[PDB]
Amino acid sequence: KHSVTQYLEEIPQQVQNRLYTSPATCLAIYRILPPLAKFFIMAMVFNENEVPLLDLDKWVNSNGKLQFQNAIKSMKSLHLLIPNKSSGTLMINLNPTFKISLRNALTGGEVQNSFGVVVEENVVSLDLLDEYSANKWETILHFMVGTPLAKIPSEKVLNLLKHSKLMEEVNSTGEFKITNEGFQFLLQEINSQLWTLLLQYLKMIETSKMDLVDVLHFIFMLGALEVGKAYKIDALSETQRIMLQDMRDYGLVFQKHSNDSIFYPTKLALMLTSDTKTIRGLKNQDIPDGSLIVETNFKIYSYSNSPLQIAVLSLFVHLKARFVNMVLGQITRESIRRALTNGITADQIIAYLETHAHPQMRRLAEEKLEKKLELDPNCKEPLQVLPPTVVDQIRLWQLELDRVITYEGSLYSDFETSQEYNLLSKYAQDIGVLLWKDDKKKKFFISKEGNSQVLDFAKRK
Amino acid sequence: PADFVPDSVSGMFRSHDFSYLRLRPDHASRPLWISPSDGRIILESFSPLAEQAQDFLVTIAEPISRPSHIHEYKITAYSLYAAVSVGLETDDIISVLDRLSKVPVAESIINFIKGATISYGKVKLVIKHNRYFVETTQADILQMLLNDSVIGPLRIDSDHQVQPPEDVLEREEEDDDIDAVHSFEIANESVEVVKKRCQEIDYPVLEEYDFRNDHRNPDLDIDLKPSTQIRPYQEKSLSKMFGNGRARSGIIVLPCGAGKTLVGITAACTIKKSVIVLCTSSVSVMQWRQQFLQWCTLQPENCAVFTSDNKEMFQTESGLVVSTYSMVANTRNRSHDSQKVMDFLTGREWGFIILDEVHVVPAAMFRRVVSTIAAHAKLGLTATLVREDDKIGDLNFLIGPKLYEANWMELSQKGHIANVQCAEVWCPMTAEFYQEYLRETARKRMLLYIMNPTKFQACQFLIQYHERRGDKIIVFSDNVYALQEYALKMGKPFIYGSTPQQERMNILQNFQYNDQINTIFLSKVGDTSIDLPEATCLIQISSHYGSRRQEAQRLGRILRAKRRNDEGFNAFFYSLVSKDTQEMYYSTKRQAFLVDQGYAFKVITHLHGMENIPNLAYASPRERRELLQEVLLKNEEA
Amino acid sequence: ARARKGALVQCDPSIKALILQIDAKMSDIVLEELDDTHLLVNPSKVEFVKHELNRLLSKNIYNPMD
């Protein structure tokens, strides 16, 4: 988890304070925080007198009071609060801007931005655009995955992917295929897919029109609700418009055509901070949408399917014979080499497959599990929960296929004594260069380019 | 030739290409939808009730029965050929597939299925009312008699005869196919090649060998004797040799040794004719005469068996016979009185012949029985049909494909055949032998494989584990040359080929019901004798390519021959797999059909506790490097 | 006093000999038999060799069972 929070906190306070104007964000980020934060924030939310510290520690009893640190670190980490060690104590209060940025929002303040959604005549249909972006939102996966349909045609979007370079494919030939990031691309479907990308916008977002609130606000304003109009008409900065253009271009925004309106709030924006139900021509029903068979017979077992996720699942198994709702494809010791041909371990595969395609394998989780949870100490010999038999073989083949590690560069060789190692190689294991730390080796390893602190101290020894 | 390959080829009909699926018919109709073009098997949302449906699935293909909604399936060409015994409404299966037209219904496959229902029951080879004739019976193989020349010109225009069913009886198509397009009475001369001509002219023709419909016999020296009983896997085989018209025979694949004489008793009892019986070796055969041959239905006196040293009463009784192929499957023959026996019985029109575990038997020697008896009917009994000698004519076009399989995970729900959880311990390797393994040559490389230090550390651990939780052991290995050294370096008995008969007795007597000297080793000819009714702790150590089949078959008699019916039966198998070595891939290729059978396998490269063994010689690796110096010797002999 | 541009390869005893045997007709391409689990190798032939290294584990199985 990249934990967008981590991206968030990267910036200094003035920028943080810059952003806290848009109230919904303050609320949005409020959701982000661990509960203690959420808790104590309220505790300070409506008392306009900075407060000591031990009191808060005196709020918590024993075990769990570590989260206090995990709490207080976080808030301090982004410095929402302002410490005051005036009287030796810590007099504390939020960034009042942010605090009022909340309170105003919390009790109907002057939030024109967070309340930028100017509702209008609702022309939105449920199936209306339900995949209308979902197509573009799905096709991009294929276009990213590399498939029959040019679902990844966004020149900016592609240039984003190329700029993002998270995909392991031949950009020289144009490919940005399943790298580990591509594998990760397969990994975090919605929360991962959205966020994992969204930063790419920021990743590309460095050149012109910083306007981060007008950027971020365009996000959480989207993250707010399907207000449709009242902003896309006017209530958005030009940075919003480009973001609006980008959002629709990213698909993540439910903006219709004609380039003059308030775009609808596509479901994605809900999914952006949902962590809830996420599924959604006219046939759109799950959970069986992802349909497949998991078992120790090394094959495709597919009645239902996601007509891309299949070829996605193929990315570790050879397609041999497509049929209407089934395909002959043998996922075997041979097939797994492909995920290693890309290189990524199919370890993500395990739980995901133990999580996905079970819609077609629901009788499986009882033909296999038998709920072998409480009978654990009554039998020395459990039964396939969760099915490891191929997974062991996988884990077997895992090393068995991998079975090597290579290094390259120069080779430092035949050192002198136990300082350069136990002065500056556990210190190379303390300044992050080494590509081998074998103490007695008297020889150590890096990657050729990586010496800026490697031909520097052993000379000094 | 005389026989046909078609008895060892399961897992077919897999009709599906890069665009197999037609407009999903069963998409709407979701009561049941097997993979049609394949013939695969899959349930449907309007229909999940499975368990009773075992039989209908039995008609077609291969399941996955640790599958959840259902198991797998497949098409099968000769599989419909087998189904002719019932011979039900052919379109009904298609009608059954009517709902199962999962894609747009694969009428071509359906036609293929109609074709898949073409041959069996559509047989064609004439027969006549106490004789044989030149005609044909069903549509699938009709002309397999009439238009013939060894069945049609080897069908003789003789009108009809039971009493007139003899002179000819173009040899006795007493076991002819389904009969009588205008049927020209069969002759006495030349079907020894017809059986070859058949598939040669490719007639999928359903042989028929009757119960009383050949009166070339005031029906001869058998009679019905039914005293026997039945465990849940008998009757199908028994009625499997009836069909239409008049009766028939065939070939059946089994883990043998289940009182298979008893099932042999019936059909022979049910023809009252001239029959002989055959088994491998006076090494093998005696596990037959007297613990599983008399609790059954036969009189105590008749039969004779022949080795001219292990000879019997020949020229004596009109009754039935029993012999060994390899006895006369060869110009091997001990007492020329063998040729006092040879000529008749060879030349004798036996109504039926019994061959047993002809599996290992090569055409290069198996054709002798083909060239020996030519009995009016035949018995198909071996171990495995998918093989290494998968050559052109398997005994099928002589008798037929396999008739009855075994059953393992869900019929044994009537009788547990020894619940298995197989083990392969993935012991790593040292280059020290391996380096000159990189210097080695022809199979004398494999000896180096036997020189692995890891086998020892595990070997006692197996003995320790088994007795730490206290159940005694049966082991498997090969290449006695040093494996014998292993034995009395394991503290355990040594067993070796090239061995006197005397010493074979001291192995079991104060050893079986005792509880102390509880370990055993095996040779490469001793396995051709017996396995204990004890110690299903089964540990493989050493094997060899190609033998894998019979090696895997060798493992068979332990568990399947067992029948005790408890609640769980916590039984297991174990094996040694020295990692980083030439064979395990072939062993995986051997493993390739391990859990094929549903009898499963689990792997442990290292368990919880392998190293707990302090009694291992070579505990430090310099004795293992002393071993190196001994490792040289034979491979320096090599 | 040295740093040859080398290519370490973490390895195994048995495969080392294999890898040695790799050099054993493709010498100089390994650089030092560091230990059973480490080997200095050839940027010009490294996974090339590991392809050659694959060849032996390809010489191992070939695993078609076809």
Curated annotation (Swiss-Prot), chain B:
Biological process terms in GO annotation: nucleotide-excision repair; poly(A)+ mRNA export from nucleus; regulation of mitotic recombination; RNA polymerase II promoter clearance; transcription by RNA polymerase II; transcription initiation at RNA polymerase II promoter; transcription open complex formation at RNA polymerase II promoter; transcriptional start site selection at RNA polymerase II promoter
Assembly information from the UniProt record: Component of the 7-subunit TFIIH core complex composed of XPB/SSL2, XPD/RAD3, SSL1, TFB1, TFB2, TFB4 and TFB5, which is active in NER. The core complex associates with the 3-subunit CTD-kinase module TFIIK composed of CCL1, KIN28 and TFB3 to form the 10-subunit holoenzyme (holo-TFIIH) active in transcription. An additionnal subunit, TFB6, plays a role in the dissociation of the SSL2 helicase from TFIIH after transcription initiation. Interacts directly with TFB6.
Recorded name of the encoding gene: SSL2
Binding positions (ATP): L254, P255, C256, G257, A258, G259, K260, T261
Note: Present with 825 molecules/cell in log phase SD medium.
Name of the protein described by the UniProt record: General transcription and DNA repair factor IIH helicase/translocase subunit XPB/SSL2
Molecular functions (GO terms): 3'-5' DNA helicase activity; ATP binding; ATP hydrolysis activity; DNA binding; DNA helicase activity; DNA translocase activity
GO terms under cellular component: cytosol; nucleotide-excision repair factor 3 complex; nucleus; transcription factor TFIIH core complex; transcription factor TFIIH holo complex; transcription preinitiation complex
Catalytic activity: Couples ATP hydrolysis with the unwinding of duplex DNA by translocating in the 3'-5' direction; ATP + H2O = ADP + phosphate + H(+)
Known cofactor(s): Mg(2+)
Alphabetical UniProt keywords: ATP-binding, DNA damage, DNA repair, DNA-binding, Helicase, Hydrolase, Isomerase, Nucleotide-binding, Nucleus, Phosphoprotein, Transcription, Transcription regulation
Organism field: Saccharomyces cerevisiae (strain ATCC 204508 / S288c)
pH dependence: Optimum pH is 7.25 for helicase and ATPase activities.
EC number: 5.6.2.4
Modified residues (Phosphoserine): S620
Function: ATP-dependent DNA translocase. Component of the general transcription and DNA repair factor IIH (TFIIH) core complex. When complexed to CDK-activating kinase (CAK), involved in RNA transcription by RNA polymerase II. May have 3'-5' helicase activity alone, the TFIIH core however has no 3'-5' helicase activity. Also involved in transcription-coupled nucleotide excision repair (NER) of damaged DNA. In NER, TFIIH acts by opening DNA around the lesion to allow the excision of the damaged oligonucleotide and its replacement by a new DNA fragment.
Coiled coil region boundaries: none
Ranges spanned by the short sequence motif DEAH box, renumbered to the chain: 356-359
Complete-protein stretch covered: 101 to 770 of 843
Disruption phenotype: Essential, it cannot be deleted; epistasis studies suggest it is involved in damaged DNA excision repair.
Subcellular location: Nucleus
Annotated Helicase ATP-binding domain residues: 241-403
Phenotypic consequence of W295L: In suppressor mutant
Signal peptide from the UniProt entry: none
Domain Helicase C-terminal: 457-611
UniProtKB/Swiss-Prot annotation, chain C:
Cellular compartments annotated: Nucleus
Pfam families linked: Tfb5
Any one GO biological process: nucleotide-excision repair
The keyword Repeat appears for this protein: no
InterPro entries referenced in this protein's UniProt entry, alphabetically: TFB5-like_sf, TFIIH_TTDA/Tfb5
Record GO cellular component, one term: cytosol
Keywords, ordered alphabetically: DNA damage, DNA repair, Nucleus, Transcription, Transcription regulation
Main subcellular location: nucleus
SMART domains assigned: Tbf5 (SM01395)
Function according to Swiss-Prot or TrEMBL: Component of the general transcription and DNA repair factor IIH (TFIIH) core complex, which is involved in general and transcription-coupled nucleotide excision repair (NER) of damaged DNA and, when complexed to TFIIK, in RNA transcription by RNA polymerase II. In NER, TFIIH acts by opening DNA around the lesion to allow the excision of the damaged oligonucleotide and its replacement by a new DNA fragment. In transcription, TFIIH has an essential role in transcription initiation.
Family per similarity comment: Belongs to the TFB5 family.
Assembly and interaction partners: Component of the 7-subunit TFIIH core complex composed of XPB/SSL2, XPD/RAD3, SSL1, TFB1, TFB2, TFB4 and TFB5, which is active in NER. The core complex associates with the 3-subunit CTD-kinase module TFIIK composed of CCL1, KIN28 and TFB3 to form the 10-subunit holoenzyme (holo-TFIIH) active in transcription. An additionnal subunit, TFB6, plays a role in the dissociation of the SSL2 helicase from TFIIH after transcription initiation. Interacts with TFB2.
Protein name: General transcription and DNA repair factor IIH subunit TFB5
Species for this entry: Saccharomyces cerevisiae (strain ATCC 204508 / S288c) (Baker's yeast)
Taxonomy of the source species: Eukaryota, Fungi, Dikarya, Ascomycota, Saccharomycotina
